[PDB]
Chain length 510, copies 4
């Protein structure tokens, strides 16, 4: 990042200059049958998984309870050594207002819709398991009240398109535009219709209540379109779930247009590109992506790039060039986390997909033009009387000045570490906490390596601080972030409890 | 653009702001069984193909007929020079495919390329300067004006890159073998490095391979594919390429249309305020009047938000010089040399137009007729409309810039 | 300007690097008894004078008519060679609302000495108008009793003597000497904290401005402008006959600085530091200077830095270090012209003062950080449909790209040359005009070398353009600006008359 | 510094926007007949003097010893009270290789075109007149030639060498005027061979060590060894004495970098400099040196004729007010008064004016660009103190703190903060008296001498000094209770470096 121009910075990128050990971008993995086993989850963790996502679009509460137990069992298998122990977060991703088709008729396995053929859509439950090439059932009872003749209707990842020609009280007559093979229970998208399904349905409420009961760390709330949607999710989690982070998934045109009010009410954002690239033209997704990462970076709030990042690894052991590009560019954009969906839930190469993201994220982070980034984050940040905030930016500046091996942060809520991550140091942030939930939610922020201290509280505040600082030193040495010869930054408070971070030291590693 | 910072530039990206109708990034399509027919080539031109790529990695009689179908489809529109879109022809070698810098079979394809009047050659597995020299020595004096584009597909070619760029007319980032030759996670570094240096030197760079891979079988690309095309344009790739997507896949027209749509949206999103500043800062003081005029016109086009920069040019050089400075505005290059007009597609933002009118005896009348030709092109293609402001560059050098209304 | 930061640009300044032949900053010389002879004026033109300033605070119309005649006689003594002819402007500087004391007592020493704490009576009684002394002081502001308040401070003689008002009275005020010193005759009086009710444009000023129109002056330096309406009264007086006379508003009090934006209504600005640093605290003047120069640069309007720039050269043949610095820094600030007053009107070394301002201006111009200045003037200037503006910025960019020997501009009103100067090329701007007044007014703009083409109008437009272009080419070679085989930028229009500059050429010097 | 461009920053300058209280730029006053008495020296400290300059071109050790004693008397008159106590440094300005004429016949007028013989025969040494001038440069005839120009009395009088002899040269008056006694002589272009460190210099320099001076201003430094010579004479007894090389000739400018590398600081000595090189080039030399000294983190002083007209007048010229402002905008750590305070009629007015202008200028600095460029030009470090300092200045802007409080023994740590040019004042708490006086060489360092005894428990002693700074800042109107300030201390006792930054409210 020594070059005086971004262009010169590009020219100096060198594929033979190896990156640093520490990978800063968090990796979110969707758990499914391919990755649900305790054995596999241990290897997922080893490979670099930081957050387990449980897609409540499918599966019972008993099923997800079991996955959650396997995740925690895999995770606590490493707990015997707190110096190498890596916290793993659990994320609930709601179903939300999904539209799906019914089952293909048992006669059949899948029907071919061919270009220009007619297809009837009905809401008569007699066909809900008898779908075929002439009659398609779906589960949105009021689909007729929201579409008109000429409307487009999209089916199965937007790969099949239908145009309404007749619009009836019970039925719709459609003309197959782009045809293909149609299976069972495929997603339906109605872009540019005013879909009246609730943001938080009754299933979502029970799912969210269940989330609080199983002590999940965060919620990925589907199809958020306005701030009041976020507030309903918040109300459901209630007082008991007040510490669970709400990550609004931006997946439709309205979500993008009202992004600022959604951002202000949310704890973070996911750029949910799968649905988003069907609700809005596929050529516009990258615009929406870079806008949202930029604004979250500017707000200091976590943002997740999601969906089809390594899609071909569902079936192949190495990704496409486009897919390698896309993961790098999400990190360069400024994403706090990258995510995997089918690639880990259902694919033939779950571990290969995690490892590839780990490799690309680390190459991309060394390619960041920190000179310009740190300069602009500072220019867009407000002036304030916050001791923690002035301490965090001081520490980041100092970390650049001595190319520190890490920035060590004692934090109870995680906030002090979040305030450091918002200014994007090159150096990893080792966040020492005794709060296990804090160590799991730390993964939402770029660069925070959360380590969980289980030593007793020391009576003398000074001795307690030194204990946790020394703990971070050993973690740093053990994982190879620095050695005894190096300099590190250390952020500590003047008294116990949240809100008291006001001290930055520059210390040689002992 | 405007915002004082790149970060605020990003925050202001607006999905509902439609882009200017002119698409600056060239689209290179590999022709194969899915695309070799005259009827679909006509539709590939209409959907936005600018360069037909012919992969000699697989008989000369087969390629001669594909080449004939391309020219047939191309001149199918020649009835009208105001709407005629030139299409170039590219020969891609096999190289060492399972070693000789240039093969014996490559020497036969290259010589076959000259006889077929190909506009450019994509040279596979270029590893050093001497490798290009062997290709240009084989192209000889007949293919003197064939543009040579070294494909960087190997570690050494990356390692010896500066050599190769100097010895070449352009570069292709050939990621499919590059991604097996070097670790896949390092390819974005090589891609962005090479595009940066090509942008710095004013030499064309193609970003190639797997950009819309999943459209070989599907009618819509993945989210990562859409991102890859956009980011290649934001890197500065003069052209983006399709290989299997148009050569053999089930949706060749769909692949072309999508690269057109994405490239256009990405061009709208380029942070011109910074890019123009850095290209200028990084480019040397010159005594060449055409170079001084070129950056003067680009600066003028930003100041007045010109509908276009019209460049009268014969060898294309004058127009290339404008394009390296990356105006937002389309560069309408007017030329009588058909090969110049075909080859222009290798430079971002050059919309070539071929004048078929006879020379007027008076140089002034001749200049004005060609300029009026560009005016009609831009009115018809919707680049600008009557009463808009445009930039006109005319002449042994294009040294004169005029700021004129659109009549 | 090749360094990537301003700090590194300073570090690279080099006293052994000689500067380009052409000096861009105009030099305005106040004409008085030291300088009003035809022979001395000739040497002042050879020494670098571009504008003759006539201070109508003193002298009769007959006196000033003679000066003006002598200026034109010396200027036209060079007219036989149009290649070398330097146009020379004439400026009328108004008296404005001046307050002066009377004449000292004849019997006492030419100067009476006032001592700290003494009493001094100020009177309007005309029997004392030529009998001022250390006890009683006449002055010519008949209304000063109405607008001065007890406790307010009165300043006399370039703000060197200060008085504190003690008692008000009928046709008098009783004051106590705060800062003493020697007091002479007809010294200027400042009342910084009064609502001085003298007319913005007095009857004397109206007579003087009509006489300026009669004498064909090029510009008016309007004294003590406080508001836009003041400028409009000056412009009404000049009327239709003087409609082409440039009005330069002198900013010399607090209200003028306060209402600067509305005043800048004007064609240009003078920073009149003499009265300014008495009307406001002297430590604050450089703030006012840098503010006004910056806003005039951003507006594209001429700004003059004036007064005491080389004051010690009134009596000494070389200046103080502070004076060398002030001139250089006025040019680095962005000032279009620098000015001399007593140094050329009444001092012992008028010629040496002109040559020093020439020497310093030239060195400072090579020290401007053009890389930053061009970038910022562009960024702050509006987008435009104007073909001439787009052509001008394009010429300045091209002139930087080929390090051109000059930008040749054909112009009738001046404005095409003005529009180029606004973006501050390093290269000189040779403005070829047939309009003598345009040639004289061009000196108000940084970097414009005006040349007056005497050749008859050629029948065809293209022929006529090529003549004037070749005239500019011969001017540049004869004056040492460029030589054959160098490259220059040439700006010409598509049609005779003002407003049609569109055309920019990069052409070798034949 | 909130404007996106320097141009917009200029346009937003506002004369009705009052400055902050603390003045960051140091003021160096030449003490002489006008300013020697204990009474006015006191009023000079109250008016803003920080460094007392003693010019050993003139005067005897005894005279200067009495000057030094009157400086220490006024300064300690305030010592009763360490909260308000302002330390005052003492600087010794060497004579150097000065060429001076003899005693006339007491002035003598001289006219252009006339002849003037200059002799080295020490007989006419006290019989100088319109026909024969005597000067003390014994090799002058070796180092000038027929056609050379010679300047006398601050470059006002000029002569041209028409005939050369053994002990003489025959010259024609180029610019005349009232010649006088013992005036100064310059030979621009003449390769003068006089020694950099003279015999009298060694005596004067040894005299400075015994008088406990804080810094030497070494005249006419031409090369690195010259600084090495001044340093060797100061020896181990005076190893803690800062050597400021005075740049006042063409070779000093050409050889500036190696002189900077060898010195503790630089003075831009514009008087001789603007005679040795063309006056229109002085501003380039001044901006070059202040920039390179800013880059390197070493103090730089802008001196000579900043307020020259105030020697006789109570108000300065517009050019002088602008010169002081622009020196501060250039980057200078201190500005200087010479004749204005040593012999003139208004030395308290001059000190006060330099205080007033410097304050308004520091308020006008475009910190946004300045801080960004100082970092980009400063190298990556492994020193904890250095990274802590830049981190503290970054924190400074982030919370716009009242001050950066630095505990420091040698001063170093406060110097490392200062080089990054924070807007907030740096209150450097020290128990070392020499450290507290020398700190004035560095822009922004408001030094305070803690006199309370050491406390046994280190963290008790640290807090003692910290709360001293708090009272200091609250009393001098820098901040008020509740304001945020930055505090730089050590971490572990005896660590030797200042690697701890805390963001605390003022108690
Ligand atoms: O729900 C999602 O994550 C999506 O659509 O990408
Ligand atoms: O050969 C190629 O084009 C490649 O590997 O990308
Ligand atoms: O009138 C003036 O020129 C002044 O006050 O400086
Ligand atoms: O010695 C000095 O101070 C000078 O020459 O300016
Ligand atoms: K879901
Ligand atoms: K999934
Ligand atoms: K006046
Ligand atoms: K001296
Ligand atoms: Mg979705
Ligand atoms: Mg005035
Ligand atoms: Mg000296």
């Amino acid at each position: 990042a020594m070059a005086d121009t971004f262009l010169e910075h590009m020219c100096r990128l060198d594929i033979d200059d190896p990156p640093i050990t520490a990978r800063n971008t968090g990796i979110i993995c969707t758990i499914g049958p391919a990755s649900r086993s305790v054995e596999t989850l241990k290897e997922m963790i080893k490979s670099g998984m930081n957050v387990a996502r449980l897609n409540f679009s499918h599966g019972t509460h008993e099923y997800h309870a079991e996955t959650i137990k396997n995740v925690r069992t895999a995770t606590e298998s490493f707990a015997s050594d707190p110096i190498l122990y890596r916290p793993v977060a659990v994320a609930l991703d709601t179903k939300g207002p999904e539209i799906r088709t019914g089952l293909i008729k048992g006669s059949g396995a899948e029907v071919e819709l061919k270009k220009g053929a007619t297809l009837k859509i009905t809401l008569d439950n007699a066909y809900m398991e008898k779908c075929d090439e002439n009659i398609l059932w779906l589960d949105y009872k009021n689909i007729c009240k929201v579409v008109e003749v000429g409307s487009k209707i999209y089916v199965d990842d937007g790969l099949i398109s239908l145009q309404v020609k007749q619009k009836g009280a019970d039925f719709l007559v459609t003309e197959v535009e782009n045809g293909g093979s149609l299976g069972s229970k495929k997603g339906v998208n109605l872009p540019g219709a005013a879909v009246d399904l609730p943001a938080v349905s009754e299933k979502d409420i029970q799912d969210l209540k269940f989330g609080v009961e199983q002590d999940v760390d965060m919620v990925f709330a589907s199809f958020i379109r306005k701030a009041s949607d976020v507030h309903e999710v918040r109300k459901v989690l209630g007082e008991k779930g007040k510490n669970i982070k709400i990550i609004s998934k931006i997946e439709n045109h309205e979500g993008v247009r009202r992004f600022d009010e959604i951002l202000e009410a949310s704890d973070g954002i996911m750029v949910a590109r799968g649905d988003l690239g069907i609700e809005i033209p596929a050529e516009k997704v990258f615009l929406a992506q870079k806008m949202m990462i930029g604004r979250c970076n500017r707000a200091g709030k976590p943002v997740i790039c999601a969906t089809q990042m390594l899609e071909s690894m569902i079936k192949k052991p190495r990704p496409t060039r486009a897919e390698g590009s896309d993961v790098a560019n999400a990190v360069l954009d400024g994403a706090d986390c990258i995510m995997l969906s089918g690639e880990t839930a259902k694919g033939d190469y779950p571990l290969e997909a995690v490892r590839m993201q780990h490799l690309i994220a680390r190459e991309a982070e060394a390619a960041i033009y920190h000179l310009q980034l740190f300069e602009e984050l500072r220019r867009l940040a407000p002036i304030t009387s916050d001791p923690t905030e002035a301490t965090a930016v001081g520490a980041v500046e100092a970390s650049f000045k001595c190319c520190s091996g890490a920035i060590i942060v004692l934090t109870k809520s995680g906030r002090s570490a979040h305030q450091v991550a918002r200014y994007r140091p090159r150096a990893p942030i080792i966040a020492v906490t005794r709060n296990p939930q804090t160590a799991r939610q730390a993964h939402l922020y770029r660069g925070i390596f959360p380590v969980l201290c289980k030593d007793p509280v020391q009576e003398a505040w000074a001795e307690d601080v030194d204990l946790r600082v020394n703990f971070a030193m050993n973690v740093g040495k053990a994982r190879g972030f620095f050695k005894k010869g190096d300099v590190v930054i250390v952020l500590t408070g003047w008294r116990p409890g949240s809100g008291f971070t006001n001290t930055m030291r520059v210390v040689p590693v002992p």
